[PDB]
Structure 1
Amino acid sequence: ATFEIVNRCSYTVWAAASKGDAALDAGGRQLNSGESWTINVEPGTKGGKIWARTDCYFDDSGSGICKTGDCGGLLRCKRFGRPPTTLAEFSLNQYGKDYIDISNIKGFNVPMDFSPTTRGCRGVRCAADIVGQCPAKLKAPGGGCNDACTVFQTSEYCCTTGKCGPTEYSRFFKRLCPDAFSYVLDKPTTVTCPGSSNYRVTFCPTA
């Protein structure tokens, strides 16, 4: 399948694409404003994620640091990223469908549209100035708006036991982005798409 990753923000990002224990495609790439990067993701993938990283440095050996979303100091992500990272999430072809979501469960760093490029299903978006508004205790020095499980490490925020409810903090993300997951047991805003669909991830969409 095909992921076209478009940086419509006015600042550079360092896109990432991982499943957890391996890169997707080249696993990351710099994207100056306006630049695009189309990747190939193997059918049937489970639990894939796409995110932006901000304020990176990488050397020629591809080794470095980012202020949001860092995946173990590399340019070419093979793990997932350090919060706060807004997340495009997907598992493809799982019995005839595709399932797409955007998640604020690790926080928010960059606004995002995740829309299908082939018919049958609706996209999802979180474009609101979450970082402009972010509750004071959840702000991240380095940039972005952290989730409460990251800031406080409690069972209730982290839903450790599989039981938890919404919180004042989950609800701050759900007031600003109702289509994105705001905590682990949020009512699912998942989208089911035809198996083998293609997609576009647009950062800073309304930019």
Structure 2
Amino acid sequence: ATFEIVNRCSYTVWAAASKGDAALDAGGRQLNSGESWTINVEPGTNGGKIWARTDCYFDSGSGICKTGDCGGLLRCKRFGRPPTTLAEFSLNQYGKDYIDISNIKGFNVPMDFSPTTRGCRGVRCAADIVGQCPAKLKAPGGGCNDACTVFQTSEYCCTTGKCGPTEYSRFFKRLCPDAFSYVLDKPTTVTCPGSSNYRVTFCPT
């Protein structure tokens, strides 16, 4: 499957793509404002994620980013450090693809995640979550942390599977109704035809 990753932000981002235990495609790349990078993701990929990283410095491809850092690598093999707005997908799962956007690991960069082929709609979280972020969730390194990252409670992290919405999750949900705001949120997952192709756009508006 092809994913065109487009940076419409006025600032550079370092795109990242991983399934947690492996890179997808090259795993990461710099995208200056306006640049597009097309990756290939193997059919059947389960639990893949694409995200933006901000304020990165890389030497051999080793360095640091202020949001979304994946163990200091330009080419991510693992998931990124919160806060990270997440484009999430599992492909060719019993004949269908499943996509969503998640704020469960916080928000750093606004994003649209849409199919480029027929049969389903896209999802978007493009509100100014960083600007509106509650004081207690603001990440000093940049972005808006989720409450699990900040407070490490069973309720925010949904550790027992028993959790409800919270004042913090409701903030993310108010700003972005079409993204997951906590682990047990009512799903905003979109079912697409198996083997669809996609575009992830940072700063779509």
TM-score by length of 2: 1.00
- State the Cα distance separating 1:159 from its structure 2 match: 0.4
- State the Cα distance separating 1:184 from its structure 2 match: 0.2
- State the Cα distance separating 1:43 from its structure 2 match: 0.3
CA root-mean-square deviation: 0.4
Distance in 2, Cα, partners of 1:126 & 1:156: 24
- State the Cα distance separating 1:151 from its structure 2 match: 0.1
- State the Cα distance separating 1:136 from its structure 2 match: 0.2
Other structure's SS at 2:65 match? strand
Distance in 1, Cα, partners of 2:85 & 2:124: 11
Task: List per-residue Cα deviations over 1:7-47 (Å, max 9, x = no partner).
Answer: 00000000000000010000000000000000000001100
Other structure's SS at 1:200 match? strand
Query: How many aligned positions are there?
Result: 205
Other structure's SS at 1:68 match? coil
- State the Cα distance separating 1:94 from its structure 2 match: 0.4
Distance in 1, Cα, partners of 2:144 & 2:161: 24
Other structure's SS at 1:67 match? coil
Task: List per-residue Cα deviations over 1:76-128 (Å, max 9, x = no partner).
Answer: 00000000000000000100100000000000000000000001100000000
Other structure's SS at 2:149 match? helix
- State the Cα distance separating 1:187 from its structure 2 match: 0.4
Distance in 2, Cα, partners of 1:27 & 1:34: 20
Other structure's SS at 1:77 match? coil
- State the Cα distance separating 1:64 from its structure 2 match: 0.0
Other structure's SS at 1:175 match? helix
Other structure's SS at 1:118 match? coil
- State the Cα distance separating 1:204 from its structure 2 match: 0.2
- State the Cα distance separating 1:142 from its structure 2 match: 0.8
Corresponding residue number in structure 2 for 1:33:
33
Distance in 2, Cα, partners of 1:2 & 1:79: 20
Distance in 2, Cα, partners of 1:33 & 1:62: 20
Distance in 2, Cα, partners of 1:157 & 1:23: 28
- State the Cα distance separating 1:129 from its structure 2 match: 0.6
Distance in 2, Cα, partners of 1:163 & 1:13: 36
TM-score by length of 1: 0.99
Distance in 1, Cα, partners of 2:120 & 2:132: 31
